[PDB]
């Protein structure tokens, strides 16, 4: 039985800039069960559907997961741009899989603010699909080298969401799980019922 519980029901989620990837392999999964397993505000599949995923074995099944704010969930979709798609987590233009999200204000916000979740704000270029950038080097926005010092034109590249329970939905935390699927001339070990 595939360890989707470990992904979806994890107690803590990754910051989007350091998004987690769990490889799924050598197990049976019930994606129709997954679909109805909770209230998901987003459950969008590209090239597949839950009903049809149960019918096939796949080769490379990945579950990526992270936290972003409500207004950014739209960026976890093929062809999107924005700080999240460009500098944190980028889906390929022709992605095969499912994007699943739910509001996690009850878990990830705190009175006084959760500043534990981070996103990359400054980057000189955009991520390739499924790329991860975990560097924390000072971003040099001007012509003078920074040499590890924060200050003027020298920015720490990450910024925090400040998750407070009284935030509007657009600024409330959302947990996101991205399921990837490939069918190759390779062993296919993640199967349905």
């Amino acid at each position: 039985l595939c360890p989707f519980g470990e992904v979806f029901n994890a107690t803590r989620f990754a910051s989007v800039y350091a998004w987690n990837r769990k490889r799924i392999s050598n197990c049976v999964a019930d994606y129709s069960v997954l679909y109805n397993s909770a209230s998901f505000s987003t459950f969008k599949c590209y090239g597949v559907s839950p009903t049809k995923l149960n019918d096939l074995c796949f080769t490379n099944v990945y579950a990526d997961s992270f936290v972003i704010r409500g207004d950014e969930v739209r960026q976890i979709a093929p062809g999107q741009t924005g700080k999240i798609a460009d500098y944190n987590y980028k889906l390929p233009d022709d992605f095969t899989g499912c994007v699943i999200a739910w509001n996690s204000n009850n878990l990830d916000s705190k009175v006084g603010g959760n500043y534990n979740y981070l996103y990359r704000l400054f980057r000189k270029s955009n991520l390739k699909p499924f790329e991860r950038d975990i560097s924390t080097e000072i971003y040099q926005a001007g012509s003078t080298p920074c040499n590890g010092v924060e200050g003027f034109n020298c920015y720490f590249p990450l910024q925090s969401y400040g998750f407070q329970p009284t935030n509007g939905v657009g600024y409330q935390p959302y947990r996101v799980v991205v399921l990837s699927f490939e069918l190759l001339h390779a062993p296919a070990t993640v199967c349905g019922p």
Partner: single-chain antibody
Amino acid sequence: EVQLVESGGGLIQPGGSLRLSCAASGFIVSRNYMSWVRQAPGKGLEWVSGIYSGGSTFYADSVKGRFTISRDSSKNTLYLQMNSLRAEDTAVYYCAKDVPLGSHYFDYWGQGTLVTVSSGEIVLTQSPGTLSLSPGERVTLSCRASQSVSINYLAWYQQKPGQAPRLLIYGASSRATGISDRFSGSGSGTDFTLTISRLEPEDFAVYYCQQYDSSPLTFGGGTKVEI
């Protein structure tokens, strides 16, 4: 320090095209977020286009497909190519340096260049429309939002006659650098206020609020304060 200087503009025939440029000092253009903002007599202050540090570009719906924002690394210059120009594009255009929080506000502005063409957003409502007071008096300006601005992403600008806007308040209550302490912002949710405690002749200006909670960023209509 930071300097933004537009060139290009002028009088163009409807459907013509035109390129604005913005030479910047004090930061590398191709590494920062930058924007174009325009001021038309009818539509007031209006975001036009933005470019990200990594190159992604964004456009207001009214200009999408006609305008192109770009930059030249070698010249430290931001550009705005305007094609298929319409009468409604008549405006003073500002290049602006973004503070990239929420949908962004602007701590540095260019000088403004006039272009004349011949022949779901949060709405900010400003009250009142014009005030006339004497020096030393206290004034409070209202900004009401059509939706809650949940983490106080509301800025205030001062635009003196013939000048670019100048940021006074960000985060609803934080004063920008060098701003006098008799400017005071407050409020939350949908109701924000700017208070100027002892009016001085130099305070003669229009005051604009701007929400950076949601995209696109939007400005209030302005309250003119006459002294």
